[PDB]
Amino acid sequence: ADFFRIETEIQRLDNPAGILANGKKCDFTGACDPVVTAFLDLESPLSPWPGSVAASKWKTIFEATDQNSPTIGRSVIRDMCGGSASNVNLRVLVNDADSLSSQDEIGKFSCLFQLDARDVAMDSLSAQWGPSTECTAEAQQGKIRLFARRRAFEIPSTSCR
Ligand SMILES: [Zn+2]
Ligand SMILES: [Zn+2]
Ligand SMILES: [Zn+2]
Ligand SMILES: [Zn+2]
Ligand SMILES: [Zn+2]
């Protein structure tokens, strides 16, 4: 397919200890205040975090106060127009809201998804969501966890943004 939509979903964050990537408690309370930014990387999906485009340019997808393990259920959508792509990386940064610039992040996650022919449905109604997939973290792997899933489907060229 040369014109298709990639839909990814940040399903949830699970941080039962209430800790940052350096292993210390959020705000030294363990009462984390997650701010989730994200970017769907089609140009450098196999490169080190953060890929093609710096996290400073990412849009905010979700905020909560005093939620260690929030349900998120928010989508990050990009179109591939005029040709093929074989993978895409949903890059996610989670900070605590407090001392944004200074406190270590909660996490740096890479949700790498394949886009083989079988992964791109002929249309949105026949698209199947892939399974809930644990994103790869720079630190605290299996202690601070992010879950995402993707679907993809052909769209008319005139709707390909
Ligand atoms: Zn072609
Ligand atoms: Zn949990
Ligand atoms: Zn969902
Ligand atoms: Zn905080
Ligand atoms: Zn760090």
Residue numbers in the entry: 66 to 226
Publication passage describing the model:
Here, we show that a novel Mn-dependent peroxidase is an important factor in tardigrade anhydrobiosis. We crystallized the putative globular domain that lacked the N-terminus 62 amino acids of g12777 protein (g12777-Δ62) and solved the crystal structures as two forms containing Mn2+ or Zn2+ ions at 2.30 Å and 1.60 Å resolutions, respectively. The functional assays conducted here suggest that g12777 is a manganese-dependent peroxidase, independent of other components of the cell.
The Zn2+ g12777 protein structure was found to be bound to five Zn2+ ions originating from the crystallization buffer containing 300 mM zinc acetate, but not to Ca2+ from the protein buffer (2 mM calcium chloride). The Zn2+ crystal structure of putative catalytic domain (residues Gly63–Leu231) of the g12777 protein displayed a characteristic β-sandwich fold comprising seven β-strands and three 310 helices with three disulfide bridges (C91-C97, C146-C225, and C176-C200). As for the Zn2+-binding site located at the almost same region as that of Mn2+, the side-chain oxygen atoms of Asp92, Asp98, Asp161, and Asp163 coordinate with Zn2+ ion at distances of 1.9–2.0 Å. A considerable conformational difference was observed between Mn2+- and Zn2+-bound forms in terms of the metal-binding site, in which Asp92 and Asp98 were commonly involved in Mn2+ and Zn2+ binding. These aspartic acid residues were highly conserved within tardigrade orthologs, and the highly conserved CD-CD motif containing two Asp residues (D92 and D98) was used in the metal ion binding in both structures, suggesting the importance of these residues. The cysteine residues in this motif (C91 and C97) formed a disulfide bond in the crystal structure, suggesting that this disulfide bond may also contribute to this protein’s function. ITC experiment demonstrated that the estimated dissociation constants of the catalytic domain of the g12777 protein and Zn2+, Mn2+, and Ca2+ were 1.92 × 10–6 ± 6.00 × 10–8 M, 2.42 × 10–5 ± 1.75 × 10–6 M, or 1.39 × 10–4 ± 3.02 × 10–5 M, respectively, indicating that the binding affinity of Zn2+ was the highest among these divalent cations. Substitution of the Asp residues comprising Zn-1 (Asp92, Asp98, Asp161, and Asp163) to alanine (g12777-D2A) showed a decrease in cell survival, indicating that this binding site is required for antioxidative stress function. The recombinant β-sandwich domain of g12777 protein (g12777-Δ62) showed significant peroxidase activity when Mn2+ ions but not Zn2+ ions were present. We have also observed that the g12777 protein utilizes Mn2+ ions for peroxidase function, while it has a higher affinity for Zn2+ ions.
